[PDB]
Amino acid sequence: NLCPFGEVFNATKFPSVYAWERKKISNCVADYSVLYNSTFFSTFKCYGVSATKLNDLCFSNVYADSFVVKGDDVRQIAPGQTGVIADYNYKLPDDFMGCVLAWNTRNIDATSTGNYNYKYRLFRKSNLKPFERDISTEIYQAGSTPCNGVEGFNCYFPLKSYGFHPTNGVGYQPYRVVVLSFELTVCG
């Protein structure tokens, strides 16, 4: 059977980067022809494997990570980055083997009144381990005073909204990202 790549790429709703979702790909044959012969993608950057030799290859299982970041934040979805998204939202291992795919979604993910649905984590104690996921909305304590539930001075909410307006620049427009991880069932 064909692997359901349309359920992640052509998905209607895409998650925020802080709460990115993962989908495991088990016994099914892959079809990377769908991914390459399209001008729909903005990046399509592979690490550890090539964008062509993957057709005649087999893996134990494939993991697909999906989320949404701004244009300037796409650069952080790569091994060895230290931005806000890479450190507090989604980190890739140094020995990552896969491909990162992203495309512009200004017409569907940016509304005139401002789409504040897509969020990201701005404050967190220490950085995330590779493939770690944090959905805690606990008040970040930046000082020595206990926050005691309420925000205020030195106590900020960890999640902030992107705020995608359709008149923004390309560096501030919404981009849907799909990270395909390869682990060593799935063949071409």
Binding site: G114, L122, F123, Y140, A142, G143, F153, N154, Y156, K160, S161, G163, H165, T167, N168, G169, V170, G171, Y172
Partner: protein, 594 residues
């Protein structure tokens, strides 16, 4: 408490960028519409941005500036730590905002009527400004000059009196001498060894550089005066000051309109490509397409697609009221626009390079944090736009674009004609700018009492600018407030510093552009070295001190007047030869009514 401040500054950058964008986009809909519904959205979104800035102002003042070690984080806290207009009471702030809005209104809504024809009533723009720029009748110009200062000037007199005392009450509460010291604080750098600059140092540097401008201006004043006597015989003394209503505009700020009366060699063809582009079928999009090509030739990036779609590059060609003042908008979020009712003229072609120069500055420092996305000082932004119009106005560039004929001979007289037109605009405004800001500095400092505001105003006009009033004014008039920048609460010393900056930039870029001829014939086109040399300062924004940003391009830690004199050096020697049988200088005692 340094890491406690870094997280605080990040909660601001990711929250202010959204509120400023909503306020900027709201104010765009007003200058692009002009309705009552859109004027409220500008004020509604404006108070929310102000109220957010006030919360972050006081909550940033709890962070002791001395406790910060990393200096990039240091300058960001001082930017937020501003009480602003809120240090006044709720009644003082409403009255201060009431007079500031009332003054801007009477300036834009004030209209004078002709006593000879009472049905003919004209406001400043385009009514009175067209008279002061084209009319050759002494009484008609005297009427427009005096009616503007006797009608709308006297109404601003009681409002400007309270404006001085209320604005001083704000600055003195924020550890400043007066409101003039508050404006001079834009050039203050304090913390970096070898690049510091005090607020009092500005007064010393502006006056030191102005002494070297006196010789060039005195010869220009003597040359213009000789030509003006032929235009207004039996009205000007060959040894006295120039009447204020004969200078080319309402205030004498620019002598550009005197070119038809002061042209050195009128027989030579004028370089006005206005009719050329009209015949070549040029629209506003063609003007900006060529301006875009100019910045690409030096290595800078192109214009965003949102610029070519959301900007207002032409007249409101449908049903909407619009202010046509050319402005360059940096709304943030990568949204860069230009509002300009462009017409198929040469003056709009050069202005398109100026306004797009502002955008290239905004695009460069976009990677900097929010509080650092601005010019080095108040004069850096206008200087960047002016160096583009300097290169775009050279005959070498106009011929390469296609606006001048390829067989246009550039004689030594065509260059003196060009430099003279430049001097009427560039060097002609320097004594006016300095004298104006010097008068407000003294008023704010408390050196000019109220009972001699206008008396001391014209004593400086005669001595510094060399301009005498045509009719006597008591303290009931308020001629300085009759200018936009004075009655609309804007500092004016920025135009003096930007003038010296643009020629330091031009000389520095033309050296990187490997130019060899005169400085006024330089075009920094194709020069990736000059573009990289300029981009190295545009990317800095307000992170590095302006003394350091200026040094990254010109190699100097302070403003210098030598590049300004080198630009007009061929013209300065020509004026001395023309004034060999004329009187260079002016007597501060002659008046057209003694």
């Amino acid at each position: 408490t340094e890491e406690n401040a870094k997280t605080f500054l990040n909660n601001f950058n990711q929250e202010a960028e959204d509120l400023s964008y909503q306020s900027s986009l709201a104010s765009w809909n007003y200058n692009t519409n002009i309705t009552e519904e859109n004027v409220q959205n500008m004020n509604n979104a404006g108070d929310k941005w102000s109220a957010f800035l006030k919360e972050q102002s006081k909550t940033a003042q709890s962070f002791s500036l001395q406790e910060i070690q990393t200096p990039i984080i240091k300058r960001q806290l001082q930017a937020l730590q501003q009480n602003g207009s809120s240090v006044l009471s709720e009644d003082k702030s409403k009255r201060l905002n009431t007079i500031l809005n009332t003054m801007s209104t009477i300036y834009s809504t004030g209209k004078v009527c002709n006593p000879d024809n009472p049905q003919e009533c004209l406001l400043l723009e385009p009514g009175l400004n067209e008279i002061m720029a084209n009319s050759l009748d002494y009484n008609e110009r005297l009427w427009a000059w005096e009616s503007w200062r006797s009608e709308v000037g006297k109404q601003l007199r009681p409002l400007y009196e309270e404006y001085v005392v209320l604005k001083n009450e704000m600055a003195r509460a924020n550890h400043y001498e007066d409101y003039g010291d508050y404006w001079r604080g834009d050039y203050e750098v304090n913390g970096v060894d070898g690049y510091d600059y005090s607020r009092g140092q500005l007064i010393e540097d502006v006056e030191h550089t102005f002494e070297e401008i006196k010789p060039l201006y005195e010869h220009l004043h003597a040359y213009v005066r000789a030509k003006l006597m032929n235009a207004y015989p039996s009205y000007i003394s060959p040894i006295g000051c120039l009447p204020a209503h004969l200078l080319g505009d309402m205030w004498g700020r620019f002598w550009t309109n005197l070119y038809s009366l002061t042209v050195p060699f009128g027989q030579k063809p004028n370089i006005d490509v206005t009719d050329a582009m009209v015949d070549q079928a040029w629209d506003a999009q063609r003007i900006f397409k060529e301006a875009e090509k100019f910045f690409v030739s030096v290595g800078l990036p192109h214009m965003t697609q949102g610029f070519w779609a959301n900007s207002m590059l032409t007249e409101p060609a449908d049903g909407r009221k619009v202010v046509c003042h050319p402005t360059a908008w940096d709304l943030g979020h990568g949204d860069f626009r230009i509002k300009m009712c462009t017409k198929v003229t040469m003056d709009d072609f050069l202005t398109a390079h100026h306004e797009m120069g502002h955008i290239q500055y905004d695009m460069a420092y976009a990677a900097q944090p929010f509080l650092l996305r601005n010019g080095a000082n108040e004069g850096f932004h206008e200087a960047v736009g002016e160096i583009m119009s300097l290169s775009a106005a050279t005959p070498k560039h106009l011929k390469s674009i296609g606006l001048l004929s390829p067989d246009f001979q550039e004689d030594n007289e065509t260059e003196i004609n060009f430099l003279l037109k430049q001097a009427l605009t560039i060097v002609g405004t320097l004594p006016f700018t300095y004298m104006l800001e010097k008068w407000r500095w003294m008023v704010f400092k408390g050196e000019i009492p109220k009972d001699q505001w206008m008396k001391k105003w014209w004593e400086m006009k005669r001595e510094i600018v060399g301009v005498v009033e045509p009719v006597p004014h008591d303290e009931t008039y308020c001629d300085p407030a009759s200018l936009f920048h004075v009655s609309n609460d804007y500092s004016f010393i920025r135009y003096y510093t930007r003038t010296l900056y643009q020629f330091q930039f031009q000389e520095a870029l033309c050296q990187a552009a490997k130019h060899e001829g005169p400085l006024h014939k330089c075009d920094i086109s194709n020069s990736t070295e000059a573009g990289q040399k300029l981009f190295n300062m545009l990317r800095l924004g307000k992170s590095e001190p302006w003394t350091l940003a200026l040094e990254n391009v010109v190699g100097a830690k302070n403003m210098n007047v030598r590049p300004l004199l080198n630009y007009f050096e061929p013209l300065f020697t020509w004026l001395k030869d023309q004034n060999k049988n004329s009187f260079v200088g002016w007597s501060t005692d002659w008046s057209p009514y003694a």
